[PDB]
């Protein structure tokens, strides 16, 4: 009843990000996606470039939301926060607008059908 | 022979860091310290604030090396790297300057 509320729709957030630099390697920023579904919670880590690659493919499947821009000061923490918010809104909009999600999108979130 | 003798050998490096931001929290940085001694290596992670908490205590024990400033508003990549290097130099200076290391320093390094 209210329990059925746990099995209706995938609820996605991006509550955090991290920028990491190891030894002499180039730094990179990863967004930590939280997926709530069927009363369970799962985390998935993705770089912006992976969202952008997803987007390019998804556009061939569905009408997509606007992706947050690649043309941002992607080294500035407050800009990275805005991007986090934008990516979160993007994933949520895909879920809201598309009753049957493309396998491309499920794969991105490590969700499988049947 | 040399049964009662041992090497006093410790080296420290900070090879990596991560800056973490999460929705209702202040962003913070965690530094990974590599500790080498007596033929073995281990790692310990410390937030930037933990270095300053160490420093405050250490000053009561010994004359400390210079440390980078306690507060950092904006962790852009060049500041992250500058603070990594500064903190590394600080830990290495403590080891070079002090024949007998304070227990509170050893505890910080998990030795």
């Amino acid at each position: 009843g209210t329990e059925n509320l746990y099995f209706q729709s995938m609820e996605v957030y991006i509550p955090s990000f991290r920028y990491e630099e190891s030894d002499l390697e180039r730094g990179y920023t990863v967004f930590k996606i939280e997926v709530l579904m069927n009363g369970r919670k799962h985390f998935v880590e993705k770089r912006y470039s992976e969202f952008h690659a997803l987007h390019k493919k998804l556009k061939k499947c569905i009408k997509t939301p606007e992706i947050p821009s690649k043309h941002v000061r992607n080294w500035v923490p407050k800009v990275l926060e805005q991007r986090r918010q934008g990516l979160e809104t993007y994933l949520q909009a895909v879920i809201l607008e598309n009753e049957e999600l493309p396998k491309l999108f499920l794969d991105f979130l490590n969700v499988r059908h049947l």
Side-chain angles (χ1 to χ4, degrees), chain A residues 1-25 27-31 33-40 42-55 57-59 61-111 113-114:
Chain A
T2 65
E3 284 287 327
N4 289 125
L5 288 160
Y6 288 109
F7 292 82
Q8 284 176 359
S9 73
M10 193 188 286
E11 175 176 359
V12 178
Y13 300 102
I14 305 185
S16 64
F17 62 90
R18 97 170 163 274
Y19 173 76
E20 201 159 334
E21 261 188 64
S22 299
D23 298 290
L24 299 176
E25 328 310 341
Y28 62 86
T29 297
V30 159
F31 297 90
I33 304 164
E34 178 179 82
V35 187
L36 309 179
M37 189 182 72
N38 301 336
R40 292 166 179 279
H42 169 63
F43 294 100
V44 178
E45 288 186 355
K46 297 285 179 187
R47 299 176 187 211
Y48 174 83
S49 56
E50 299 177 283
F51 288 84
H52 195 262
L54 172 62
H55 180 69
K57 293 186 276 208
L58 258 186
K59 276 192 288 190
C61 295
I62 58 171
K63 173 171 166 175
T64 54
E66 298 180 11
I67 190 77
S69 181
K70 73 183 303 184
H71 308 298
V72 305
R73 299 186 305 147
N74 60 28
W75 65 91
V76 174
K78 70 184 165 177
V79 174
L80 289 179
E81 165 59 15
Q82 199 64 43
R83 176 171 272 186
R84 181 203 65 74
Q85 289 179 37
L87 293 173
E88 178 178 78
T89 296
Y90 179 92
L91 292 180
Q92 292 178 352
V94 172
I95 295 162
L96 184 62
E97 293 167 14
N98 302 274
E99 202 90 49
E100 296 182 0
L101 293 168
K103 181 173 189 296
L104 283 173
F105 186 85
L106 301 177
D107 285 346
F108 183 86
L109 297 180
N110 296 328
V111 174
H113 213 304
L114 293 214

